[PDB]
Amino acid sequence: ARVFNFAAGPATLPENVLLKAQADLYNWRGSGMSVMEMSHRGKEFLSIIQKAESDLRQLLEIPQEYSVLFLQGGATTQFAALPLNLCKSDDTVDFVVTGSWGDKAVKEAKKYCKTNVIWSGKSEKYTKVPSFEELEQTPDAKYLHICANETIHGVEFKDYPVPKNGFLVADMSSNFCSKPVDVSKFGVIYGGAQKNVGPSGVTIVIIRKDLIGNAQDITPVMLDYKIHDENSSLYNTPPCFGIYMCGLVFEDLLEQGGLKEVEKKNQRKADLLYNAIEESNGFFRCPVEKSVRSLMNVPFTLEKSELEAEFIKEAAKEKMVQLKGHRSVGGMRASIYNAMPLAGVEKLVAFMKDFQAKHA
Amino acid sequence: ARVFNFAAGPATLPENVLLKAQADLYNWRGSGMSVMEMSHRGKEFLSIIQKAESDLRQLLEIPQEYSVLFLQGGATTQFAALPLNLCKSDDTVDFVVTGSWGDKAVKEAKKYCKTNVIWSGKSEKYTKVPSFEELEQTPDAKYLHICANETIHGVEFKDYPVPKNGFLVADMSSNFCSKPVDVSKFGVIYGGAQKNVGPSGVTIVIIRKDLIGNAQDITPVMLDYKIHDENSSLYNTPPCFGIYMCGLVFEDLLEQGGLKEVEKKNQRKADLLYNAIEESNGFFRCPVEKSVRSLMNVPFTLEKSELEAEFIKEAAKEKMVQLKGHRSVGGMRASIYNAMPLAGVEKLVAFMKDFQAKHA
Ligand SMILES: *[C@H](N[C@@H](COP(=O)(O)O)C(=O)O)c1c(COP(=O)(O)O)cnc(C)c1O
Ligand SMILES: *[C@H](N[C@@H](COP(=O)(O)O)C(=O)O)c1c(COP(=O)(O)O)cnc(C)c1O
Ligand code: NA
């Protein structure tokens, strides 16, 4: 039997998607070959990548004046690609840092331009999002960078800051296609697929067309947005199978009723877990400020922290796996992405109630 | 029915490997999840990447003092990573250019250091390999770059030049694991997996351990060999499912008897096609000099070139697809990688003989 897989990325996937991929793995739609053997210059793969793009455009209501790029290298490669493409070496980028993934973006961007961290959550252990009107943005900043869902720290933007001088860029890796997003407010949205929308090996970049072009001279060709855009993500050999898998996920999210329906389910199942924590009378604790609690990644600790290893081991015996926190922070982390069944969060909640009764 | 798929990359894969992947896709070995859902930091995936590495080490007889890295970005990303990691910006790299893939590696390296093309086959249409003793290598060249199998032009190194000042770097994308290689002759071997050893999304880099480190300060962290080496290719989220597929391919190459036997089969089926061309009294032509004719990619043309579209259409109607040449050169190109069944080459040869008879 399949387990309830609380991993933060790569992560659990819908069973109907996995079964479709199994059904077609040897011979996709009578083409006589697997997706994994198709030429990226051929008509079958063309149909796949084009439908993945159109389905994603439908899901997020992406306006026509945005490009959609399917790339390799992870969100971490975009930490370099963003300043290399969007800035000159003496331009400045503003960052709002609400957890360690935004901090990693700052440190990589320092190689390629000037960076200003205009706000950091670190003094309160990355539990909060700033009041935006209070933000002091840099008068000449090319763009303002956020990590919309801080996967380790469980801090999620529920509304967005307005850039003063330039455009907004958001790492949406761990809440990608979890809810509607006004894409027009952003110059760039990017995310690795593996958290919430596919297998690892694909990164999606949604980028306003008038921002493509004029990358720095030292930009590798494989990081150049203009190269990717003008070749429709087929400049070199793309991650064909991962793009196909993302397409299955997008098609299925549309069948579920789209991102408004996805968000409803995420909110419901996240409420069950957060309520159980809040009702445990301190036995379980979530440090994050209520209004920015992530629907995707739920970090929590035990008041008796020495009990956390037993919690994690017994949960895994109960077929609930990968609940240990990220190694940087420890504690526990329940990642409850789109495809996590409601019954899995219910099982974790019932396990938590039973564990507390036995250790209190 | 499945077709004979002569694509140059991505390419045909073994049917037993595809079917193994299919049977484990929903729940790998009763572990309760797909490979596609496994955490890269969990023991199941660690077991997979570790065996893929040791199996590849067995196949190529890789010495202990070399690292094996499983990366994203394609071989094209390595065109930037090689000089970024291995050179200072005022160092010089020598290139022997035997086709257009070597030319693409020169153009990218020029962003990051100096380049000398010490020999180029362009003047004779990329049909030959130089005499090595006569090469004029640059006295202080950090390394000498070759493309061991020029995929579009059908030119293949059968033995290797000896670098004068530095070490040898070879792009082996399209003949990777087609035959034994004395790895100790090289400082770096690299290759996209999708030509001969898996689906696209994985690039393999075999690099002598004393060459790792001291990349240029502008090197993106995701292109840095020391980062990847010290994290055992798990610095960020790896292309887990492509690595797993590579592992299945490697396991099956071992079961076939290793690269000595793989090479024997490649030589046998290449000979059938090359002999058919030479016996065709000019009806089909291969321009490449006989001693360097690739076993992996066989470009050929029709004396009556106006027949090429009918040849390709009739071949496809006979379940032989993707025989058109690379778009940069035209003609025909039969890619006949490890997994291309002998029967597919035989069908091609018989179809060619019939085609000539009908268009005498
Ligand atoms: C991915 N975060 C995951 C994985 O973290 P590690 O175990 O340290 O690799 C998490 O568990 O938090 C992530 C990334 C990085 O994307 P890749 O380069 O691996 O594709 C970037 N931004 C966000 C918000 C992430 O969650
Ligand atoms: C891959 N060459 C293939 C693919 O060529 P395109 O259709 O132009 O993409 C071919 O048909 O010749 C190749 C590469 C590039 O690898 P990726 O960056 O796409 O992974 C580099 N070197 C060699 C020898 C190649 O064959
Ligand atoms: Na099975």
Numbering used by the authors:
A (entry chain B), B (entry chain A): 71 to 430
Give the article text.
PSATs are PLP-dependent enzymes that catalyze the second step of the phosphorylated pathway – reversible conversion of 3-PHP to PSer in a Glu-linked reaction. In this work, we describe a structure of the isoform 1 of chloroplastic PSAT from A. thaliana (At), which is further referred to in the manuscript as AtPSAT1. The three crystal structures of AtPSAT1 present snapshots along the catalytic event showing PLP internal aldimine state, complex with PMP after the first half-reaction and PSer-PLP geminal diamine intermediate state.
The reaction snapshot in the AtPSAT1-PSer structure actually shows one of the reaction intermediates – the PLP-PSer geminal diamine. As a result of creation of two covalent bonds, the C4′ atom of PLP presents sp3 hybridization. In the PLP-PSer geminal diamine state, K265 and its neighborhood present almost identical conformation as in the internal aldimine state (the AtPSAT1-PLP structure). The bound PSer creates several hydrogen bonds in the active site, which include: a salt bridge between PSer carboxylate and guanidine group of R403 placed in the β14 strand, an H-bond between one of the oxygen atoms from the carboxyl group of PSer and N𝜀 of the indole ring of W171 from the α5 helix. Oxygen atoms from the phosphate group of PSer create several hydrogen bonds, either directly with protein side chains or through water molecules. These include direct hydrogen bonds with H396, R397 (loop between β13 and β14), and with R111∗, H110∗ (loop between η2 and α3). The superposition of AtPSAT1-PLP and AtPSAT1-PSer shows a pronounced movement of the loop 391–401 toward the catalytic site associated with PSer binding.
